[PDB]
Design a protein around this ligand. Sequence first.
Ligand SMILES: CC(C)[C@@H]1CNC(=O)c2cc(-c3ccnc(NC(=O)C4CC4)c3)nn21
Ligand code: NA
Ligand code: NA
Ligand code: NA
Length: 545
Amino acid sequence: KPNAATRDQLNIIVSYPPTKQLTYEEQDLVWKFRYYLTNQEKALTKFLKCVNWDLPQEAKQALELLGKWKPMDVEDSLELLSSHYTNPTVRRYAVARLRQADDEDLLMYLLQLVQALKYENFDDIKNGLEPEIDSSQIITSPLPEQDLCTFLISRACKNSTLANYLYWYVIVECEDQDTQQRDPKTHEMYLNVMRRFSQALLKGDKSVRVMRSLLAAQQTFVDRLVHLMKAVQRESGNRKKKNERLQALLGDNEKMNLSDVELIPLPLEPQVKIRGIIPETATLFKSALMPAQLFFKTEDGGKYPVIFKHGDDLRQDQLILQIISLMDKLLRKENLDLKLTPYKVLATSTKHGFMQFIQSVPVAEVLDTEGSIQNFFRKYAPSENGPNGISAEVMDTYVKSCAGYCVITYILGVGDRHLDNLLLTKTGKLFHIDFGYILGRDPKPLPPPMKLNKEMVEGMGGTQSEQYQEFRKQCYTAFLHLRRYSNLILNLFSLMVDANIPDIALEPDKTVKKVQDKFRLDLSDEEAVHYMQSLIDESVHALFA
Ligand SMILES: CC(C)[C@@H]1CNC(=O)c2cc(-c3ccnc(NC(=O)C4CC4)c3)nn21
Ligand code: NA
Ligand code: NA
Ligand code: NA
């Protein structure tokens, strides 16, 4: 029905990011050719955005069109679960489309889906109970029935990994005392989700009932570890005495039940089943907050070191590591493995939680003990035939992880980057830790948008090396890949705006735009490549000037 000119304009509208507000003219255009648009699954979110849900005649027709639309993709369904959708039929449609995801993808979204329960009908949850262009770089830069609660519990009953995270994510929401004080009905809702969850597990078959007892075992274990950390952190004396107390309490299994337990899924990574904590290798970090390093004995004879923080809110780190995990999985789906280190983070309360400990050396220590990253690589991965006398595999891994983290920390606006938050493995993996400053916040004024340093660049042989050329190519390639998933990434951030995460809570209404602006969606792919190269070029020039 539309001509080539309106079809061109409709294509622009359907192309918009999920964040873009349609003008009155665009809404009218979308609504007029709604029947024409039923063929385009990507047009459905735009159409639903044109509906005045508070006008009954309009809602009725929008729901008829909803039933006739080419079904929308999983990633678009996340937009229908935000606070901007109340219509029960729309929200059920979202779950029906979300349900086509496999559990691997669902797990990538689950932190946000647990936030989205805030936007569901709280009575239904309760009732279920039983109560620009650089010419010289053109040629060198070629282009490459159920509601949400019922649904999540249903999938969790069938998948112990999903059940693990659903349990702990909900526990943390229940313990959020800001939510308790300021939004008591939301606190009640999360309690009811947990009661619904427990009730469903108790009704299941033999292994589903065992899942309930394993979550209880984990909760009890974590409670004991918290009791231990309180005892250690209040112990009289100095650090020697505190470490001795830490190890003595861990060694007293009859008292504390932390060093010799029947196999329990590790909350941090429930695929890993643990036999207890090794008493003799546990110590406190020197940090004044006294987190502990703890080595878990695993089912298969391994050791899994963690950081257990007590007295500290891990939720911002948890979100950032969950998003880095997602970005890594999206890049890998595009067959780009940049050797990233999305270490696990799991809050077990609003004031304690786990991080996966990655063996590595802080770059500041690399420099102080070996003088440079290349000297470090030459010491631990020598290769006579390799670049600068370093193993080609290690250098490749370094260039790739450098590019991946440059692009990812740029998108996430990570600040407070110093050489003790940058870690390096002897296999060449560079990675970032400690995400207390995100979305453009920095402890110093005028943080640069791009977080590079001379040491990284010298590590890849300087700006004229082959490795540096490959670094730049990996940067703009990862950038183009992540732009292609900007709808999904932005939809997930939109679900976090009411989370009590410090750097989001500061300006919830501006949070998603802080991320969107970094993708430069106003730029074509070709323009975006030159933008990213100007970013790197300007950053590196400043380092050496
Ligand atoms: C005092 C800490 C809690 C420190 C500060 N805040 C953090 O959030 C954090 C994350 C990590 C971390 C995560 C994964 N792996 C490592 N690995 C290493 O530290 C090896 C170099 C020795 C560190 N550390 N921190
Ligand atoms: Na299903
Ligand atoms: Na230990
Ligand atoms: Na895609």
